[PDB]
Structure 1
Amino acid sequence: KSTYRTPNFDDVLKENNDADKGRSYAYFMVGAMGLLSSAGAK
């Protein structure tokens, strides 16, 4: 078994399409983090 064969990742890979949806979730929750942090600090 050579290293050119990537190990199995299907059990953890994102089967759904629209990778922007995950990006949208990530940036929305980062914005929520910033929002709550700023509100609490103020």
Structure 2
Amino acid sequence: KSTYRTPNFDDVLKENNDADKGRSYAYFMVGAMGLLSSAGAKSTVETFISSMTATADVLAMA
């Protein structure tokens, strides 16, 4: 048939598009992921770095 006729997309479309609400919920979930990934990567580096400080038997002879 004619290429100007668009097929049926109605079982996935929102009843009201409302562009301020759809961009706001998607950016909440991406922002929460970057929040938790930065706090997780920070404690990971500090676990490896603090293993080079003085051990428990060295501190006992201080």
> Given the two structures, how large is their TM-score scaled by the length of structure 1?
0.83
Q: Which one has the largest radius of gyration?
A: 2
Larger mean CA deviation between 26-35 and 10-19 belongs to 10-19
Q: Runs of 5+ in structure 2 lacking a partner?
A: 43-62
4+ runs deviating over 4 angstroms:
none
TM-fit CA distance, 1:33: 0.8
Q: What is the aligned-residue RMSD (CA, Å)?
A: 1.1
TM-fit CA distance, 1:19: 2.0
**In the aligned structure 2, how far is the partner of 1:16 from the partner of 1:41?**
39
TM-fit CA distance, 1:32: 0.3
Residue aligning to 1:4: 4
- Residues matched between the structures, number: 42
TM-fit CA distance, 1:31: 0.6
Q: Runs of 5+ in structure 1 lacking a partner?
A: none
Task: Give 3-state SS (helix, strand or coil) of 2:27's partner.
Answer: helix
